[PDB]
Amino acid sequence: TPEMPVLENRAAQGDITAPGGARRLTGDQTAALRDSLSDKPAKNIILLIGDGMGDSEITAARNYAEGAGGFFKGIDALPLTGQYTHYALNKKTGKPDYVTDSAASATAWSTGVKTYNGALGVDIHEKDHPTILEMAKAAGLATGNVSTAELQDATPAALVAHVTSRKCYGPSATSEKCPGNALEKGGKGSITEQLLNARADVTLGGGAKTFAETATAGEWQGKTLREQAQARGYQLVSDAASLNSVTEANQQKPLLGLFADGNMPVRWLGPKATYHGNIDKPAVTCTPNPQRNDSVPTLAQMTDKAIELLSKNEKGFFLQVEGASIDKQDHAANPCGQIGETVDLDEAVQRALEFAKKEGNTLVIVTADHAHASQIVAPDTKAPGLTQALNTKDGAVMVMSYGNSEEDSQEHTGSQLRIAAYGPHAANVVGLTDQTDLFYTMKAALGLK
């Protein structure tokens, strides 16, 4: 039912070289914003995270894919916006650590407590805290966790695992790096073992490799984690046909989709940026990655499937969806891979908003875990790092720069960044907020105890 509006168009309205032609607005917004404010309960929440998707990453993707004056029909369409802070903490001192990793930030919105880089579901004293997904399930809501990364990666793992190091994917790494969590030492187990215990109704992503490990203790000792999932009643799917065939997902038959051995394939291919890449080389045009395929569900397809299965729960549901490789390609100084994964996320955001606008009691939030390296610079820039010129939709060149690491991976950055929302309680993302306020916002919107 239409009541709260989703923005229909914020593209430049006309000829950008003419007076008024670059305007994104067509009239006053006071009434539209009033219509966007409701404090009624959120029956459902869909939280979409672009990993590393700072304002710079949004702008670069929009400039390339949609044109400077273009509009992301998903990402740019949420009417209530603000800027939030995502600093982590130094484990020893408890003081702020100004640049977080994916684990401490996902732990912050999923538990409401700040923590140290690399921690999942625990605070600086390594004490476990319940996550918004575990809380939703406990309250009888359906739950979904979707990501284009390995499911053991920090972002999706924070919702279902409590470990002292994000490296504890399976039994082997846990025994070596998180001895206190190792199952054979009396702990709760590896990230994959804890994910199997958490039992969200719908879990979709990559990361099949770790399921080949076998447990070192417990009821399923000696069996692979895949065998364990099967013995525990999970429906396992591995491709788009398998996924489409699923008709239900619930506690009796939870769904686990493992679509790649490690990360899922990126949407677009292009070369890595290089030293004086914008002065020494010709411009790059991105191209679709052949490895995608009709056999691999897209992030928008996984999102739609999750929504269809979780919406069957009369009480409501919580769903987190992660466009994971925006960050990974930004680390790899690869504009095409980075931008393609941002376009990918925009499609999933559109599916979420289409659902939310019709359902009327769904709060949709779109943001990032932290900012990143990429910068949009003048075409004639002579920079010390890695740069690349790109042919955009506008038929002009845009140059991107990665200038914060001499090491193999570009670095995260600490800038506050955009958080946007639509639906019941969306006012709580406007103005300056902290990433831990998002936990409390989601908890209150759902009316959780």
Question: Hey, which residues are catalytic here?
Answer: 102
Q: Residue 60 binds which one of a copy of itself, Co ion, none, with CB within 5 to 8 A depending on kind? A: a copy of itself
Q: Is 269 in the site for a copy of itself (CB under 8 A)?
A: no
The contact mask relative to a copy of itself for 372-401 (x = CB under 8 A, - = no) is -x-xxxx--xxxxx------x-xxx-xx-x
Q: Is 212 in the site for a copy of itself (CB under 8 A)?
A: no
Query: CB 283 → a copy of itself: shortest distance, Å?
Result: 13
Residue 252 vs residues 199, 202, 233, 256, 402: alpha-carbon distances, Å? 10, 12, 7, 13, 48
Q: Is 357 in the site for a copy of itself (CB under 8 A)?
A: no
Q: Is 16 in the site for a copy of itself (CB under 8 A)?
A: yes
Q: Is 371 in the site for a copy of itself (CB under 8 A)?
A: yes
Residue of 7, 10, 47, 51 that binds Co ion (CB under 5 A): 51
Query: CB 327 → Co ion: shortest distance, Å?
Result: 4
Stretch that binds a copy of itself, among 191-199, 228-236, 257-265, 415-423 (CB under 8 A): 415-423
Q: How many angstroms separate the CA atoms of 60 and 63, rounded? A: 5
Q: How many angstroms separate the CA atoms of 328 and 157, rounded? A: 16
Is 153 annotated to bind a ligand? Reply is: yes
Q: Residue 155 binds which one of Co ion, a copy of itself, none, with CB within 5 to 8 A depending on kind? A: Co ion
Q: Are strands 202-206 and 235-237 parallel, antiparallel or unpaired?
A: unpaired
Q: Is 341 in the site for Co ion (CB under 5 A)?
A: no
Q: Is 102 in the site for Co ion (CB under 5 A)?
A: yes
Residues 55-84 that bind a copy of itself (CB under 8 A): 55-56, 58-60, 63, 67-69, 71, 76, 78-83
Q: Is 436 in the site for a copy of itself (CB under 8 A)?
A: yes
Residue among 294 and 406 whose Cβ is closer to a copy of itself: 406
Cβ proximity of 160 and 131 under 8 Å: yes
Residues 113-132 that bind a copy of itself (CB under 8 A): 113-114, 123-124, 129
Q: Is 324 in the site for Co ion (CB under 5 A)?
A: yes
Residue among 51 and 213 whose Cβ is closer to Co ion: 51
Residue among 321 and 383 whose Cβ is closer to a copy of itself: 383
Residues 351-380 that bind Co ion (CB under 5 A): 369
For 51, what's the count of Cα atoms within 13 Å in the CB-facing half-sphere? Answer: 28
Q: Is 412 in the site for a copy of itself (CB under 8 A)?
A: yes
Query: CB 10 → a copy of itself: shortest distance, Å?
Result: 4
Cβ proximity of 290 and 267 under 8 Å: no
Query: CB 215 → a copy of itself: shortest distance, Å?
Result: 32
Residue of 2, 406, 408, 449 that binds a copy of itself (CB under 8 A): 406
Is 155 annotated to bind a ligand? Reply is: yes
Q: Is 302 in the site for a copy of itself (CB under 8 A)?
A: no
Q: How many CB atoms lie within 10 A of CB 185?
A: 13
| Residue type for position 358 | K
| Residue type for position 145 | N
Stretch that binds a copy of itself, among 53-61, 161-169, 188-196, 288-296 (CB under 8 A): 53-61
Q: Is 290 in the site for a copy of itself (CB under 8 A)?
A: no
Is 51 annotated to bind a ligand? Reply is: yes
The contact mask relative to Co ion for 116-155 (x = CB under 5 A, - = no) is ---------------------------------------x
Q: How many angstroms separate the CA atoms of 311 and 364, rounded? A: 14
| Angle, alpha carbons 316-318-321 (nearest 5°) | 140
Residue 24, Cα to own-chain centre: how many angstroms?
A: 27
Q: How many angstroms separate the CA atoms of 38 and 159, rounded? A: 27
Q: Is 37 in the site for a copy of itself (CB under 8 A)?
A: yes
Q: Is 444 in the site for a copy of itself (CB under 8 A)?
A: yes
Cβ proximity of 418 and 80 under 8 Å: no
Q: Is 76 in the site for Co ion (CB under 5 A)?
A: no
State the number of binding residues for Co ion (CB under 5 A): 6
- Token digits of residue 403: 């200038």
Q: Binding site: what residues are annotated?
A: 51, 153, 155, 322, 327, 331, 369-370, 412
Q: Binding site for Zn(2+): what residues are annotated?
A: 51, 327, 331, 369-370, 412
Q: Binding site for Mg(2+): what residues are annotated?
A: 51, 153, 155, 322
